[PDB]
Amino acid sequence: NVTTPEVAFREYQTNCLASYISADPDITPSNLILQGYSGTGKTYTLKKYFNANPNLHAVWLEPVELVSWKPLLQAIARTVQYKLKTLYPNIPTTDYDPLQVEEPFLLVKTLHNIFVQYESLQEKTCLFLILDGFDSLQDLDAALFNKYIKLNELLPKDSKINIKFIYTMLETSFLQRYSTHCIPTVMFPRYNVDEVSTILVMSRCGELMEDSCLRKRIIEEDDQFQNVAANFIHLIVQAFHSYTGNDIFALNDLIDFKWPKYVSRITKENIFEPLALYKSAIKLFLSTDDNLDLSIISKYLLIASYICSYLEPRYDASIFSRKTRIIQGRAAYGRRKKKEVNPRYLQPSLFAIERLLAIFQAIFPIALREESLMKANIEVFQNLSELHTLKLIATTMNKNIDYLSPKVRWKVNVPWEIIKEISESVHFNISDYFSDIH
Amino acid sequence: VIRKFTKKNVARAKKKYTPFSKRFKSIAAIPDLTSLPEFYGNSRFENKLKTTQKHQIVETIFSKVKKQLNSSYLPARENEFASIYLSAYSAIESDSATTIYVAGTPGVGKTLTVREVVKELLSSSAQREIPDFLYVEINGLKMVKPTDCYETLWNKVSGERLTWAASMESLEFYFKRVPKNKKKTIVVLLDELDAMVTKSQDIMYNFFNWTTYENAKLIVIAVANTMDLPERQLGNKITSRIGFTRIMFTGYTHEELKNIIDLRLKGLNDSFFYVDTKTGNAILIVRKVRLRMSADAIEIASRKVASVSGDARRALKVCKRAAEIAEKHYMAKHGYGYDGVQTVHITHVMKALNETLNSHVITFMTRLSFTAKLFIYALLNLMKKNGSQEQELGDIVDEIKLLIEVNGSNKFVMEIAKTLFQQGSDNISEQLRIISWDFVLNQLLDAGILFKQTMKNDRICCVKLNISVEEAKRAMNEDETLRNL
Amino acid sequence: SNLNRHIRMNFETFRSLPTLKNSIIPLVATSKNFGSLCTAIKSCSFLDIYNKNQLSNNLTGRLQSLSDLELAILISAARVALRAKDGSFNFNLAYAEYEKMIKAIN
DNA sequence: TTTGAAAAGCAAGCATAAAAGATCTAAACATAAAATCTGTA
Ligand SMILES: Nc1ncnc2c1ncn2[C@@H]1O[C@H](COP(=O)(O)OP(=O)(O)OP(=O)(O)O)[C@@H](O)[C@H]1O
Ligand SMILES: Nc1ncnc2c1ncn2[C@@H]1O[C@H](COP(=O)(O)OP(=O)(O)OP(=O)(O)O)[C@@H](O)[C@H]1O
Ligand SMILES: [Mg+2]
Ligand SMILES: [Mg+2]
């Protein structure tokens, strides 16, 4: 005897929730799992099921707000006691403190003491504790869910209050860890693009047709506005479904970012013409647009660090050497071959400080008592220390780092797209050093 | 004031902190402690487990045998008894402090012999030929904390309840400074001595160093499981204080085990009961039924137990299990309930000895589903191929898929392939894992058949057999489909 | 019959009566009348929908939920990982494979 | 202007240094009930 609500593309899931969740504790499982990835309508379907059956007693917990297992136990005790106080206000109760629950055993004792003072009730009832997002706990281990599986066996069997657990999970592999427990599971597969578009239209067209920018636009310049909002949502879906996938939240964010810019380009010619309005605002559908000072010594030290990380030390003398030799001796010959793989795609290498200072002095911009080469003074080492403090460069160790040890090596910690823009700010030709190696 | 965290379940005992050195103002101020009303031993829970008996239970012909063969009810330990008794009697009568080290395997009568020694010593003290002493029993496996022995022994001596540190200086003051004329001899049984071994080894040093004090009048009888414990785990000080003399309790021979079982079966074997044929209740002296347990069965069980362990607990339990098998068959035959010759035969003794030997692992693997057997077959195939003891799970997936797709012409594979990869259903697409793959993986992990490493990539994760390879091979080629291919 | 086929399938894959009960319970509970229950227990058509839902979030169904660009990036990462020795890859090599693949398509 | 030849370069082999992290342990930081002290009434 239960009401099955209408959810647009979750009919099987809603029928399963009608099959498993009822007010009778004999024909209800002790544990029930709803498994699906993010934005698959698990919470939406559970809310529509419990709203259409107001006689079912449900307690809602978000483990993401609790983070650890001990606040989860204390939250269980507190919320069960508050819900049982609200439900039967004419039953006198001792108020057990939630903060005395530090073990699962103490939760069993506290739930025993709470449920033993409601035996004056005439019928057996269910209390549905919903842990919406169990595996979204931040400090999760493999042993925590076993305690919640076996929790119902330590509570009395003839109690008037019989607690029932409903779990929500995201990842398949976490659920697959507990397959031999044979817990009933309802799975929420990801929507396809048609159901995503239908959900987006039926959930956002009402908010779009009454937004203040459109209401100012139609007086500055219901069904037709509904068609305008729906056509915008369909255009957003076909423009950015490959970017977002079947993600309701990302498409919702894109709709929110691009709706007022779309409304601002609506004229009295564009309003009844969809193709003309799309051509007026086509630049909203060509780019996702999901987006939001440093010293000369530190820039050139970053360029030298990038060169030191992504070029071999043996070919240094073939690239930077320029001095006239008083003493006879051949310089480096250079590399014969070109690399098959771009080194910038891989992890950076580790170098010494003296090599970094040598290449920094070789690439820094410029008589008898001048010495135009810049030596490594206080400011170079100070800028290097800021460069490590910002982690634009990094080391092998990060905690209790010995800066002065010779065993400690250094690497660059910026990608190529950052060092390119930094080298554009100083007019250095860094791409010349990688055009002839691969 | 707002707390950063709370401790809401702190349970602290009512233990004082001031030790015995500060009770009296002087050494001469201490009275004779044997006259104090709290010192030297001068239960409320036994009535809690009482109920009203409103039924009449039936005790059958084998009921008295099973009740009598329990461990709750000293033939073969008479040299060890004489050694422990003579050392402890000489230590009591001369007012000395002595360590007696006793070691042995489980169930060879160490605790029984030391308890019989202290009962004869208390009886001898009751006849006023040795001075009176207090007997303290400390079991290291019955303590929550190892320092609680400090809590226990001092509470047995003074009757005070202190924390463990204050109890430790109280015991040190009592054993060193208090004179002999104001004290009473104390005999301490330290049982499960290895359980009282810590990193600091302070409890070991204190308990064996008090036996080196002139005024102590302390006899420590320490029970160990090995004889090389003071050399392996303890330092040279504690090993020197324990001493060179060390009493080893050997495992019982089959003559000794047979003597123990015959001592428990005196008055019942070759005896007659009056047995009711209506209910089954039997009375020791309606039919007159003779009860026997054969000596050949007892000697077989004694020889087996003596070769495996020499354990009196196992010999008594094997005899009791044989009697219970016989009594179960008796109640099945006569239809008796739980309200001319009956014999515990040698076949019941062989069944009791074989029921802990029959290797259910092969039987468990034989009674598994086809997917679990296919997993084990694929893993064994990989161990045969690349010769490694650990195989990646993706390799097992690929070789299961190969085993299905190569021997397709088998009729069982043509029957099972749609079940394995589509669960017998159109509108279910072809699956990368087999049906119930994670189920049989977790099931073999639960049994201890498999070990799986802790990795989050399911393909490069390794799986090892925890059981022997030959029993997995014989379980696999017991299966008619898997041995066919 | 269809029950005997599903019982044989369970016997050869799970060999578990709780696994069978977890599918039989919503077959009984979703019937509105007695004729619907008899039709459900003859056809066992609900058990196939149940088995399809129990496999809807594995690798195959998650692959079928992917977009075309998602599939292209996954394919490029897969072939880079196949060409690698340890199977390791990053975003840069996968994007390089993706752009070579898109240029060779276009 | 050639020459060639010792300096530079490349790759396989393999022992070994080192990065990463799994596991743990001490030390600072923190709370708390019972016992003990202590300064007066
Ligand atoms: N079937 C549906 N019909 C209408 N709106 C839906 C439907 N499914 C989802 N939505 C809308 O999409 C939103 C996201 O769904 P929901 O919060 O239930 O997802 P979820 O699977 O619980 O996600 P998560 O694991 O990230 O919390 C809902 O709040 C609702 O506005
Ligand atoms: N000589 C014996 N005569 C009779 N019964 C014996 C004898 N030795 C042992 N038993 C029986 O075996 C039981 C177990 O022996 P006991 O507790 O003395 O063993 P233990 O050697 O101290 O073993 P553990 O190391 O396990 O403590 C005794 O309670 C008794 O029933
Ligand atoms: Mg949710
Ligand atoms: Mg013992």
Side-chain angles (χ1 to χ4, degrees), chain B residues 2 11 55 112 133 140 186 213 248 251 256 277 305 327 376 427 429 468:
Chain B
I2 302 304
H55 288 86
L112 194 63
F133 63 97
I186 295 158
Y213 288 166
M248 178 56 170
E256 296 167 319
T277 66
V305 168
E327 191 276 331
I376 296 167
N427 296 114
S429 61
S468 72

Side-chain angles (χ1 to χ4, degrees), chain A residues 6-10 36-48 62 132-133 136 168-170 188 191 195 198-200 202-204 248-249 252:
Chain A
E6 293 179 353
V7 190
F9 305 102
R10 308 276 88 172
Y37 288 90
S38 178
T40 43
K42 303 177 290 295
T43 308
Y44 184 82
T45 311
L46 206 49
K47 297 291 179 67
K48 298 293 183 182
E62 294 293 328
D132 204 351
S136 294
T168 286
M169 288 174 205
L170 281 168
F188 286 72
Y191 303 106
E195 319 163 342
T198 306
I199 282 161
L200 279 183
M202 93 167 83
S203 72
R204 296 293 300 274
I248 295 162
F249 302 129
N252 265 340

